[PDB]
Scaffold this motif. Sequence first.
Motif, PDB file in Angstrom:
ATOM      1  N   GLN A  86       0.933  -1.158   0.130  1.00 29.11           N
ATOM      2  CA  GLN A  86       0.094  -0.080   0.187  1.00 29.11           C
ATOM      3  C   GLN A  86       0.750   1.135  -0.046  1.00 29.11           C
ATOM      4  N   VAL A  87       0.351   2.170  -0.980  1.00 26.30           N
ATOM      5  CA  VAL A  87       0.975   3.615  -0.907  1.00 26.30           C
ATOM      6  C   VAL A  87       0.194   4.557  -0.808  1.00 26.30           C
ATOM      7  N   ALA A  88       0.199   5.749   0.090  1.00 25.44           N
ATOM      8  CA  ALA A  88      -0.711   6.566   0.355  1.00 25.44           C
ATOM      9  C   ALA A  88      -0.318   7.850  -0.302  1.00 25.44           C
ATOM     10  N   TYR A  89      -1.159   8.440  -0.946  1.00 30.21           N
ATOM     11  CA  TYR A  89      -0.805   9.967  -1.633  1.00 30.21           C
ATOM     12  C   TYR A  89      -1.483  10.914  -0.946  1.00 30.21           C
ATOM     13  N   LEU A  90      -0.532  11.870  -0.526  1.00 28.53           N
ATOM     14  CA  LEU A  90      -1.006  12.915   0.418  1.00 28.53           C
ATOM     15  C   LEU A  90      -0.707  14.066  -0.384  1.00 28.53           C
ATOM     16  N   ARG A  91      -1.665  15.044  -0.018  1.00 27.25           N
ATOM     17  CA  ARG A  91      -1.624  16.450  -0.637  1.00 27.25           C
ATOM     18  C   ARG A  91      -1.075  17.370   0.670  1.00 27.25           C
TER      19      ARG A  91
ATOM     20  N   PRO B  50      10.501   9.004   7.522  1.00 29.78           N
ATOM     21  CA  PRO B  50      11.980   9.152   7.430  1.00 29.78           C
ATOM     22  C   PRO B  50      12.272   9.258   6.073  1.00 29.78           C
ATOM     23  N   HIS B  51      11.457   9.132   5.156  1.00 28.90           N
ATOM     24  CA  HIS B  51      11.815   9.591   3.818  1.00 28.90           C
ATOM     25  C   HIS B  51      10.669  10.081   2.943  1.00 28.90           C
ATOM     26  N   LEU B  52      10.963  11.202   2.464  1.00 30.29           N
ATOM     27  CA  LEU B  52       9.729  11.959   1.546  1.00 30.29           C
ATOM     28  C   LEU B  52       9.985  11.724   0.135  1.00 30.29           C
TER      29      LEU B  52
ATOM     30  N   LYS C 287       3.870   5.626 -11.364  1.00 32.29           N
ATOM     31  CA  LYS C 287       3.959   4.473 -10.477  1.00 32.29           C
ATOM     32  C   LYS C 287       5.428   4.670  -9.558  1.00 32.29           C
ATOM     33  N   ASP C 288       6.204   5.441 -10.108  1.00 29.55           N
ATOM     34  CA  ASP C 288       7.529   5.821  -9.497  1.00 29.55           C
ATOM     35  C   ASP C 288       7.424   6.681  -8.323  1.00 29.55           C
ATOM     36  N   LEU C 289       8.439   6.344  -7.140  1.00 31.26           N
ATOM     37  CA  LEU C 289       8.508   7.270  -6.162  1.00 31.26           C
ATOM     38  C   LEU C 289       9.689   8.028  -5.914  1.00 31.26           C
ATOM     39  N   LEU C 290      10.056   9.250  -6.063  1.00 34.76           N
ATOM     40  CA  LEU C 290      11.163  10.116  -6.308  1.00 34.76           C
ATOM     41  C   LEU C 290      11.475  10.660  -4.927  1.00 34.76           C
TER      42      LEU C 290
END
Length: 660
Positions: free
Chosen positions: A294-299, A321-323, A329-332
């Motif tokens: 699960q990946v949560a998308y926050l504004r 700990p990591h932003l 689909k990628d997390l930068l």
Amino acid sequence: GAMIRTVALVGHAGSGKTTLTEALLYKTGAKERRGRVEEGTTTTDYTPEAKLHRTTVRTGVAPLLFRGHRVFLLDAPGYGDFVGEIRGALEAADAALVAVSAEAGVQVGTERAWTVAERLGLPRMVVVTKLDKGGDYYALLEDLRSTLGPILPIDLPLYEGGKWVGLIDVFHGKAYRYENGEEREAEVPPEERERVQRFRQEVLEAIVETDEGLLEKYLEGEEVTGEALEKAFHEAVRRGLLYPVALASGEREIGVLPLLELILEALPSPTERFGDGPPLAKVFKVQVDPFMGQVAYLRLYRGRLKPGDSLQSEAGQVRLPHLYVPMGKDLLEVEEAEAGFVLGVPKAEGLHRGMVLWQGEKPESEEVPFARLPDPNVPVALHPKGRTDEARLGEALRKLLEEDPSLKLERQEETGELLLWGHGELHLATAKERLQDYGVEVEFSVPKVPYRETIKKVAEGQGKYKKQTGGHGQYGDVWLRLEPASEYGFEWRITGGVIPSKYQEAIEEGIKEAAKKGVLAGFPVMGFKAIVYNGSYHEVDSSDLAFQIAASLAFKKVMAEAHPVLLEPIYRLKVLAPQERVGDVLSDLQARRGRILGMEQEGALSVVHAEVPLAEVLEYYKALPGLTGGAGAYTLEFSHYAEVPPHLAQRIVQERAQEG
Ligand SMILES: Nc1nc2c(ncn2[C@@H]2O[C@H](COP(=O)(O)OP(=O)(O)OP(=O)(O)O)[C@@H](O)[C@H]2O)c(=O)[nH]1
Ligand SMILES: [Mg+2]
């Protein structure tokens, strides 16, 4: 200086939203090459469902970097099937960029996006795409004017020999042509100058009129500086008093970066909307990757964040700990985040769509953007394909609903079936495919109709239970009278204390249990008065159990002589079809055993009220859009039950009876 903007790109399906998003990512350097929807190579549409149906099933995040400025563009879906993602994208943005196909004009998907944005109090900008496929831009502006209101034309199209090759910046009196993926300044054609000047004047006047300060100067005689106009323009758009209209195409590669510059100049920053203060955020969507979890998308609406920081939530402290900034689909990974940023939080099993996050005082409802989702209205009985599926179906559905809460899963009380409710055939099809991405095969079927039973004439009888198993025995005696009625009701008419009042609850429970399965066809019974008017008990052997059983025994005996009748659910329709698309809607209902109740014909669109059985409209979602020119939506709601026409009544009764 290092500006930030969060914008939702919305609009009807096929208006070129994702293609525009690709062009932006490519022109800014975020992507090596711009892909195509046709080839399934875009950043936004990466899930199997999106590529298969050639449509944006899930909102894609496109973090755009331009000369130090950042625009987090949310490429939302177009079909109403994905209202969940669309409304979430708008909840997450500070403004809406509404794409409008030039050849189609404002469509149903346009109006829906526009309205949700307006209710959320968001500024709106329009971008006209597909002018190369045809359409008259000037007539389009007039339609937008009459339909949306205070639009403000920023661009006019540059044509060469009838071919669209660029745009004319109205305000600055400059034209630009594109070719070989290159922007070049061109002259404003002589034949266009008078019209361009007219639009410029109207633009100047529209801006001056929304600013009292400028209206005072324009009237006092003072000079209106260019900086003054820019400020007035920005403020007017922020307050929703003007709607800029840009022209761009990701396919023709025209006006792409100019659209980005306009976004920065016209749309508001997070600070201009929320002001400054402690961190305030919200999970606007959730993705559950088959492998990554699960990946949560926050504004982040307000505040700043650094790696290692934490936020409070209803689920407790949320460490970061990591932003990460999402790009498809990628997390930068980034080293810091400011308001306007959209973040991706991995291993977010504890974070769900709608959760608010904060530091300091907990926010109250009005401080956080919110867009309610309409309930899903398309049901399908769900069935695992086989053994392994039936076992893994529980966990697969959990993940499916975490990712898509617009889908609702319910257990039909009467029918016992496991139903999955969606917003359309397409939505459900994507749900089916997604379940398969989780390793589970399921199949849909039309839900069994929740038929019911009732009685047509009065009947009376006794129900008695007297046995002795073990030390003590059991004793229950009840005289019951069943009367046909519109509403169910229990009537205690016991006299002389022949049955203590303490057994009233047990007696009624027994009547209700037996009523769960009628005598006519095994369906729930309704519309009857259960009258207990006599009986007896023994202080020694009587108990709740005995009377429940006695009461049940009596209901079954008595109903059998009350002239049973099979009922069926009846719903009311509230179709919304165009002018001449009404002779096709009222022509369809006749084959569905319908009945007209009224027709509100006002202006263009005319409402068409009706009434029809539930057993006749279970798959009416697979027909209405194909008869109301797609510009219409059907509405079905429960009205009341009724006697199944003798023809079917007998038919249905036979089936249920045939086997068990
Ligand atoms: N001629 C022309 N075709 C375009 C333009 N923009 C997009 N298209 C094409 O039209 C279709 C629409 O593509 P998307 O960019 O996928 O549209 P969307 O508006 O994002 O669609 P949904 O996600 O379904 O709401 C694609 O097949 C594109 O190749 C344009 O400016 N001109
Ligand atoms: Mg799309």
